[PDB]
């Protein structure tokens, strides 16, 4: 069997997290169909014309169906 | 001039203020952080080879005051060395302060401070999950585009002491050799499928044999036997990943062959989880330090997806 180097400690440390209101806006729940279409178009144009991508990675650029 | 020490001091000084206080950086200060960090990322490998001692942290999601508390506990750089696993921005109140402090520390301590790419460090995701809107409110869309160029150059995975494989998401059916990671060229986007997608998006699932469908609608799930075979093939001991909220801030899978880390306590004020970091000492002993808070109408998921823009 294979020799394992890693070990885990059973003794965990805990500290009290900050008490504050962490709630944040959810803009992705406020998109009409037309808004989504506009964002797909915006992203596609940005990625095609402005966003630098290495030649060997242009096949990875993620386009959205308009 | 980068004005780096002034930037760091201003980012840190709000630790004694009420939670949520913004830090007033200039547009050109933030641009400089993006451009200089990007240069450093490109100068280092896309598959980082790191050595302990190190503290490893999972998702932060703009919870800047929790990031400050995490650094207070672990030691502010350069007192400890850090590796973060991605998901710095989106789905929180202060993505800008969060990413600016992380980039400033990367520039200041480039051999002692490391950042991997999460699935939120890409344009299609952070366009909609909050970061674009935060940039627009405080600065402009051009600044968001500058951040995108920086994010497109983040490294994707790390191996610690030849034994801990780290990435945001998880394994891929397309990952047969580490050379496949090393061959990925930056800047790059994150695709909707393939190796780079899976490294940033996949999840473990105890009830999957092999590779399965992912509830997110992107990438895959993978089972415990996939983990075991991967570790055996590559002579590794642990996969360390992030990307899922877990109650204690850390959670094991596959008889401790994988761990999930999540560093944002009380995630977005809707979940009752702790945030954790994993410390790896020079003997390869791993330990945990946690910051713990005090029908169809069921609570929503905490996970993100890649298909929210679909027509
Ligand atoms: Mn996340
Ligand atoms: Mn994620």
Residue numbers in the entry:
A (entry chain C): 515 to 580
B (entry chain A): 6 to 299, 320 to 336
Please share excerpts from the published article on this structure.
The three Protein Phosphatase 1 (PP1) isoforms regulate diverse cellular processes, acting in partnership with over 200 different PP1-interacting proteins (PIPs). The four Phosphatase and actin regulator (Phactr) proteins are novel PIPs that are implicated in cytoskeletal regulation in animal models and cell culture settings. Here, we show that Phactr1 confers sequence-specificity on the Phactr1/PP1 holoenzyme. We show that efficient catalysis requires interactions between conserved hydrophobic residues in the substrate and a novel Phactr1-PP1 composite surface, which comprises a hydrophobic pocket and associated amphipathic cavity with a surrounding basic rim.
Fusion proteins comprising PP1(7–304) joined via a (SG)9 linker to unphosphorylated substrate sequences were coexpressed with Phactr1(516-580) for structural analysis. This approach allowed determination of the structures of the IRSp53(449-465) and spectrin αII (1025–1039) complexes at 1.09 Å and 1.30 Å resolution, respectively (referred to hereafter as the IRSp53 and spectrin complexes), but was unsuccessful with Tbc1d15, Plekho2, afadin, and cofilin. Each asymmetric unit contains two complexes (RMSD 0.22 Å and 0.17 Å over 288 Cα, respectively), in which substrate-Phactr1/PP1 interactions are mostly conserved, albeit with some minor differences. The substrate sequences, whose N-termini are largely unresolved, make extensive contacts across the PP1 catalytic site, then extend in a sinuous trajectory across the composite Phactr1/PP1 surface, making numerous hydrophobic and ionic contacts. In IRSp53 complex 2, K452IRSp53 (−3 relative to the phosphorylation site) makes a salt bridge with PP1 D220 carboxyl, in the acidic groove, while water-bridged hydrogen bonds link the mainchain carbonyl and the sidechain hydroxyl of S453IRSp53/S1029spectrin(−2) to PP1 Y272 and the phosphate, and to V250, respectively. The dephosphorylated S455IRSp53/S1031spectrin(0) hydroxyl interacts with PP1 R96, H125 and the phosphate, its mainchain amide and carbonyl contacting the phosphate and PP1 R221, respectively. The phosphate is inverted compared with the holoenzyme complex, losing its contact with PP1 R96 and H125, but making contact with the S455IRSp53/S1031spectrin hydroxyl. The structures of our Phactr1/PP1-IRSp53/spectrin complexes are consistent with their representing the resulting enzyme-product complexes, stablised through the tethering of the substrate sequences to the holoenzyme. In both structures, the residues +3 to +6 form a β-turn, allowing the hydrophobic doublet L459-L460IRSp53/L1035-L1036spectrin (+4/+5) to make intimate contact with the Phactr1/PP1 hydrophobic pocket, entirely burying the +5 leucine sidechain. Pairwise combination of substitutions at positions +4 through +6 suppressed reactivity even more, with the LL459/460AA mutant being essentially unreactive.
